[PDB]
Design a protein around this ligand. Structure first.
Ligand SMILES: Nc1ncnc2c1ncn2[C@@H]1O[C@H](COP(=O)(O)OP(=O)(O)OP(=O)(O)O)[C@@H](O)[C@H]1O
Ligand SMILES: [K+]
Ligand SMILES: [K+]
Ligand SMILES: [K+]
Ligand SMILES: [K+]
Ligand SMILES: [K+]
Ligand SMILES: [K+]
Ligand SMILES: [K+]
Ligand SMILES: [K+]
Ligand SMILES: [Mg+2]
Ligand SMILES: [Mg+2]
Ligand SMILES: [Mg+2]
Ligand SMILES: [Mg+2]
Ligand SMILES: [Mg+2]
Ligand SMILES: [Mg+2]
Ligand SMILES: [Mg+2]
Ligand SMILES: [Mg+2]
Ligand SMILES: [Mg+2]
Ligand SMILES: [Mg+2]
Ligand SMILES: [Mg+2]
Ligand SMILES: [Zn+2]
Lengths: 118, 177, 134, 299, 80, 74, 48
RNA sequence: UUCGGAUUGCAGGCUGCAACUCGCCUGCAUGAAGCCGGAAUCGCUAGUAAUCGCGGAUCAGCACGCCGCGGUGAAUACGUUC
RNA sequence: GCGGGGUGGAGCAGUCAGGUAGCUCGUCGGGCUCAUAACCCGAAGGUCGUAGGUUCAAAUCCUGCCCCCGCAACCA
RNA sequence: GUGGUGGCGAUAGCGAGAAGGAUACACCUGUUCCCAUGCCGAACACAGAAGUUAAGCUUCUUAGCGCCGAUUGUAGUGAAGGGUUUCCCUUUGUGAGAGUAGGACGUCGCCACG
RNA sequence: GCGGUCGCCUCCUAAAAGGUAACGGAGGCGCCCAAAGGUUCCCUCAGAAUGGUUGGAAAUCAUUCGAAGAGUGUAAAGGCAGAAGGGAGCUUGACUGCGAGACCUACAAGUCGAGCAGGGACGAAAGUCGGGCUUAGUGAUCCGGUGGUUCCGCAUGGAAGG
RNA sequence: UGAUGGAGGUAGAGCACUGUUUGGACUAGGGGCCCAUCUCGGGUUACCGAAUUCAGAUAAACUCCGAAUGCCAUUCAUUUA
């Protein structure tokens, strides 16, 4: 008998504290990241309005796929260009309670390169 | 790999059949093994703790975590944070290897060995074996030990019931009384 | 009767206004002694009332003392001028407000109960009346 | 403080000054005690005795002014305390040296077929002059030097403690406490003994590199004491030690219940130890100790 | 697994000298004697005299005679 | 012996709800965070709530059992 | 034993900062990287 | 300790009606204190002290005791202050 | 309320200024003596009133508490 | 329908029980990789898709716990008065806590995949 | 008169803003930390039950229950489990020149402060940092010491002295 | 003065925390006491009884709650100055 904590629950416990000093505005939306064992998702959200201005993920059918790190980089590029189309340039990067090390870091760097200012 | 192979091959189907599990995921398994050596003599001489730590590391194959007294107790001449007692955690392949060696070699070498207890269950399917003395593990070398000492080996499994835990441990080989 | 401990050695005299907050009805016993006025009751008075009640009952039945002298009161010795801090603790009292059931009794015929409660009331400093369990 | 004269004159002048200072502090304490005793008497008198209560407060003011001008007696500097005891017992033949020859490669043989035998609980003095082989012989016994010829045998009952001449047993980089760290002694035991050697509190965390030669000598001696050996190979132990500590060292060794192989050019230290047999160098001569030591020195 | 802090750990084979029961498991101790093993591999061999198979308790049969009754001692003593 | 006490610290609210206040005005003095700082409201080194901007003060409830102060410019 | 100390810029020898330290816990002279207003840049300040 | 031979377990030999209280002895096993003994104190002047055995009376059985026998075999005595 | 003290059986050090528990008498045992005393030789006897802090370490420093001793507890 | 992400006082919860993984989320397979354990690839990080709804997870049932909670009455009390005035009473306004009827196993949004 | 007290912090008195006295009821302060500060990241307690060598009520170990019953250097109150509690890495913002505007207030003082500039610490970034969970840990002027100073320098240059 | 919005923990009330506290149920444990001791293995007082639970109280320095008033403020409304 031993219980293995829900990793998503632990993520969200950290993510609340992260969000306490990160919020999305119309002129500086929140770039939230969510990570799955299979996929990864990015959302540009306006917390004031509570609406996802733009979205990208490993299910867009525009990302051919590959290694999960490479999929994250492709998703980062895709969200950056979609956000640019909607005129969104500056963003505040919400790492969603993860560690800014691997897949999330690759996604963030892809977004930075493709034009999101942060 | 012997004990892991034994488990996955023989034990898993046997437990599945015995306990009528809908899905294989329900099969109890040894999650981890935590071996704790409580050294109160550290207060008198830290070298006692150092020798105990060296013995435990040799026995286990991993550097132990040197636990510290969470509270200061005058009864034992103990101040909070004093490095009294050590432990090691073993999972996966190292866990299986150490458990197999304990079953085969170390247990027979125990003085006047008549088996292991059959009641040291927490009530949730986790067992603990209280070793009275070292020198039963072949790695000890029976000579380096200036002072003989014991330990407590806690086997933590996913078994929900003491019954399932007992079956798994027996199948893995446990000389219950 | 004295508390084993007190958080504060000295305490305000206080004010007794209105009915008792609780314990106005007989809980355990068959009969009870209800105070019709508000007044301090010393541990000495409680003990005197208890002795009277029990002795008349012949130590039979059961007796409950609902009140307890939680509060402490101090005093100043004769020949001491006003000031120089509060006086040293002297005695213990229970502030009893009208409607409180100070004593309860059971296990005895009604005449014995009424007579025992009458003796206890005469020992106490408050006007009282007899009440039956509902 | 600078005096005119010699060492004795300084001691005479100093001893008198501390005596005259001590008497001053005594009399200042008596007057304070006198006032204190009266202040208390007034304090406990009846509140109705107005005059006594008044006088008590007046003397309380004088008592306060006294206690604020009362010279503190300087704490007398504490002397070293040594209690060297052997764990085990000496044998009748602690050390056997037989036909031992040794030469430093490229230099004349210091001694040829040197053979001596110590008896146990014996004060053995290795006499000689500078550059004659005294320290070489002691290094030979410990094992620092391997004998060119012969054998050196220690009885299994013999534990040996070595005090090197040049203080080569201390780590300058480490602290005092780190140097004395041993598997057989706990922390407070180390601190207690270091306090007996005048290393108090955070004085044990000082690096050995900043200590004076004399303070380092105490650490080496402390290491020797903590061994609790029954054979003491000491090479000029009193070197670097202040005259007071030398007498303490000699007196305690005299009472040591074990064998002592000592080298010392200090005439006072050898007298206190009470040497039994002296070994002269370079002319090997195992001899009974006596004022004939002077005869060898003359010759 | 951290590097350079764990005691040297190596695979090793154990054989029960009495019965010859074999098993491969890791250990801190190393054996100069080495043996072959299935899969075409060799490992250091740490021979052991007492193992589960050899030890009486695992077998379930006891080597000891369990001593004698005192009257039986007396029976053999006086031929009775 | 009793008879000691410290000067009162004049804690409490210093601006009413619905009042207009200039930037930097102290809204609330407190020990600890009895009331939390909301929008455009900062909390000082000693838990004093002040307005970061000019606006009207509003005391709201932060959830079930916590209060909060916000300053809304017009 | 805790005592107030002055930190002086090692470059311009300007007594710039005032602080305090426990001698027992920090026997050696304290050193910090602090802004030197005279030189208007961060420099090594050592206790005197 | 290959000194020591207590204590203890086992297994036995005898005598006796009988060996637990409570005999002696034997074999195996175990292997205690003890490293030459504080204040003080004892015997002995030659075949003596020391030391080595042997026999005996008592006695079914049972002595490190007692009586007796021989083997080997010393040191010291200046002197009578105490 | 003001002081003084709690260490071996008794009396006292040691406390200030942290390292290691002592002196005297007394007690127990053995000697000497015809016997007792004196004398001689051994041994025991306290975790320092107590509970917590400070320290690496407390008989020792800090705090409280409990005991015992002396004084005071009201003045024209 | 599922998965992200929010707003609103738990009427959003807790407990118990039931169903599902098509997708998705998960467990799950390993440590070669960046990275990591004051020891452990348990965690964190990485690579992958053998099996499972077992667990989490989502949906559903349930008022057992927690939560919300009307009306009436009462205590208290502002104002105006009275009395035998430590206290008590009267007129007028306000009006709890407690106790209860009852509510409630959430609702209001955005996005991606269906 | 004797005893007690004199300044600062916390609570109750204090009558639900603030303030409010008594020789009223209770406690603390005259410091501490070179990390017990800043930042980034990460973590969640106390006790209980059960099982387990020394080990005993109670040392360390494991599962479960457990919303705070812990901890927060230090009194109490307030606050804190989105941590202010705890661990680790790097660091010195425990910065310099200030400071709109407030609180408090007889004065002298005391308290808070966004924000600007300079030059930095941490972080990928957002951003945080002008000491510490908050509130005690302090003393006017005169006089003197030490350092800096493009200030003055009794005819002028220095000096002395400011 | 009315309307509106606020901050606060008093009266009252309450036991959700902290003290104080009554009775009932049960009992760890403690006290006696016997047998049997290896204090040890038990059987007992309706002996004292922790903790839990049921019922019932209590508080200036207790609060899950919580007024009436008073207080702060409104480019508000009426009157007034
Ligand atoms: N490591 C060495 N290498 C070469 N020669 C040496 C060495 N050590 C000593 N010698 C020589 O040995 C000779 C004597 O040796 P040793 O060190 O014993 O002198 P000593 O007896 O200790 O004299 P002292 O202590 O009074 O100075 C010296 O002349 C010296 O030069
Ligand atoms: K009456
Ligand atoms: K017999
Ligand atoms: K015979
Ligand atoms: K894994
Ligand atoms: K499931
Ligand atoms: K519900
Ligand atoms: K840090
Ligand atoms: K109250
Ligand atoms: Mg030399
Ligand atoms: Mg105050
Ligand atoms: Mg601050
Ligand atoms: Mg011998
Ligand atoms: Mg004769
Ligand atoms: Mg209500
Ligand atoms: Mg008021
Ligand atoms: Mg107020
Ligand atoms: Mg802190
Ligand atoms: Mg001039
Ligand atoms: Mg009230
Ligand atoms: Zn500079």
């Amino acid at each position: 008998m031993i219980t293995k904590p829900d990793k998503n629950k632990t993520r969200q416990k950290r993510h609340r504290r992260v969000r306490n000093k990160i919020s999305g505005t119309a002129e500086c939306p929140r770039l939230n990241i969510f990570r799955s064992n299979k996929n990864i998702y990015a959302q540009v959200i306006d917390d004031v309005a509570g609406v996802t201005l733009a979205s990208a993920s490993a299910l867009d059918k525009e990302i051919s796929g590959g290694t999960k790190t490479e999929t994250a980089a492709a998703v980062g590029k895709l969200v950056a260009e979609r956000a640019a189309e909607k005129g969104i340039k500056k963003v505040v990067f919400d790492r969603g309670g993860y560690l800014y090390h691997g897949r999330v870091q690759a996604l963030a760097e892809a977004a930075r390169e493709n034009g999101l200012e942060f | 790999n012997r004990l892991k192979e034994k488990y996955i091959k023989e034990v898993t189907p046997s437990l599945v059949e015995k306990f009528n599990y809908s899905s294989v995921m329900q099969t109890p398994k040894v999650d981890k093994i935590v071996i704790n050596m409580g050294v109160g003599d550290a207060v008198s001489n830290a070298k006692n703790l150092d020798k105990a730590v060296e013995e435990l590391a040799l026995i286990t194959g991993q550097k132990p975590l040197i636990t510290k007294a969470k509270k200061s107790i005058a009864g034992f001449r103990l101040r909070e944070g004093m490095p009294i007692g050590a432990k090691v955690t073993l999972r996966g392949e190292r866990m299986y290897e150490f458990l197999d060696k304990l079953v085969t070699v170390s247990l027979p070498r125990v003085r006047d060995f008549h088996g292991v207890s059959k009641k040291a269950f927490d009530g949730r399917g986790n067992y603990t074996l209280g070793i009275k003395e070292q020198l039963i593990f072949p790695e000890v070398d029976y000579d380096l030990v200036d002072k003989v000492r014991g330990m407590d080996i806690v086997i933590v499994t996913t078994a929900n019931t003491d019954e399932e835990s007992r079956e798994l441990l027996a199948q893995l080989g446990m000389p219950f009384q | 009767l004295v508390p084993k401990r007190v958080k504060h050695r000295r305490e305000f005299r206080g004010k007794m206004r209105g009915e008792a907050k609780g314990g106005k009805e007989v809980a355990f016993g068959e009969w009870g002694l209800q105070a019709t006025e508000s007044h301090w009751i010393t541990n000495r008075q409680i003990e005197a009332a208890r002795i009277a009640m029990t002795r008349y009952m012949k130590r039979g039945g059961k007796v409950w003392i609902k009140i307890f002298p939680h509060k402490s009161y101090t005093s100043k010795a004769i020949g001491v001028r006003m000031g120089k801090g509060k006086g040293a603790p002297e005695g213990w009292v229970s502030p009893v407000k009208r409607g409180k059931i100070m004593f309860e009794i059971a296990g005895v015929p009604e005449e014995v109960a009424r007579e025992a409660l009458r003796l206890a009331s005469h020992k106490l400093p408050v006007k009282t009346k007899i009440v039956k369990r509902e | 403080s600078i005096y005119e004269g010699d060492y004795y004159t300084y001691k005479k002048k100093y001893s008198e000054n501390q005596l005259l200072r001590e008497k001053m502090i005594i009399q200042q304490e008596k007057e304070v005690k006198e006032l204190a005793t009266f202040v208390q008497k007034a304090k406990q008198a009846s509140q109705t005795n107005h005059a006594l209560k008044r006088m008590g407060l007046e003397r309380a003011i004088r008592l306060d002014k006294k206690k604020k001008n009362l010279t503190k007696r300087d704490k007398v500097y504490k002397r070293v305390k040594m209690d060297i005891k052997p764990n085990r017992e000496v044998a009748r033949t602690p050390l056997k040296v037989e036909n031992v020859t040794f030469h430093y490669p490229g230099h004349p043989i210091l001694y040829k077929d040197l053979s001596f035998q110590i008896s146990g609980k014996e004060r053995f003095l290795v006499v000689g002059e500078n550059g004659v082989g005294k320290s070489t012989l002691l290094k030979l016994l410990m094992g620092i030097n391997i004998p060119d010829k012969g054998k050196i045998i220690f009885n299994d009952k013999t534990d040996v403690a070595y005090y090197s001449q040049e203080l080569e047993q201390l780590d300058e980089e480490k602290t005092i406490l780190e140097n004395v760290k041993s598997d057989e002694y706990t922390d407070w035991k180390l601190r207690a003994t270091l306090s007996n050697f005048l290393f108090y509190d955070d004085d044990v965390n000082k690096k050995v590199n900043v200590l004076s030669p004399g303070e380092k000598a105490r650490i080496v001696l402390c290491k020797v004491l903590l061994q609790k050996a029954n054979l003491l190979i000491l090479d000029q132990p009193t070197n670097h030690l202040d005259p007071e500590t030398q007498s303490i060292i000699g007196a305690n060794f005299n009472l040591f219940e074990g064998t002592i192989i000592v080298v010392s050019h200090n005439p006072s230290f050898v007298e206190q130890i009470g040497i039994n047999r002296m070994l002269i160098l370079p002319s090997g001569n195992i001899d009974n100790y006596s004022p004939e030591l002077l005869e060898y020195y003359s010759n | 697994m951290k590097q350079d802090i764990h005691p040297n750990y190596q695979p090793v084979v154990f054989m029960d000298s009495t019965t010859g029961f074999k098993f491969l498991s890791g250990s801190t101790k190393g054996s100069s004697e080495t043996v072959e093993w299935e899969d075409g591999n060799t490992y250091p061999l740490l021979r052991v005299e007492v193992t589960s198979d050899s030890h009486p308790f695992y077998t379930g049969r006891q080597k000891f005679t369990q001593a004698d009754g005192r009257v039986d001692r007396f029976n053999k003593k006086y031929g009775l | 012996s009793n008879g000691r006490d410290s000067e009162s610290k004049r804690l409490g609210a210093k601006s009413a709800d619905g009042q207009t206040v200039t930037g930097g005005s102290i809204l609330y003095r407190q020990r600890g965070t009895k009331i939390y700082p909301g929008v455009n409201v900062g909390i000082g080194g000693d838990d004093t709530l002040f307005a970061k901007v000019d606006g009207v003060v509003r005391f709201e409830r932060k959830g079930r059992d916590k209060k909060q102060v916000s300053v809304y410019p017009v | 034993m805790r005592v107030n100390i002055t930190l002086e810029c090692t470059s311009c020898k300007e007594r710039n900062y005032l602080t305090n330290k426990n001698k027992r816990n920090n026997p050696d002279r304290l050193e910090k990287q602090k802004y030197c207003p005279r030189e208007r840049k961060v420099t090594l300040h050592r206790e005197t």
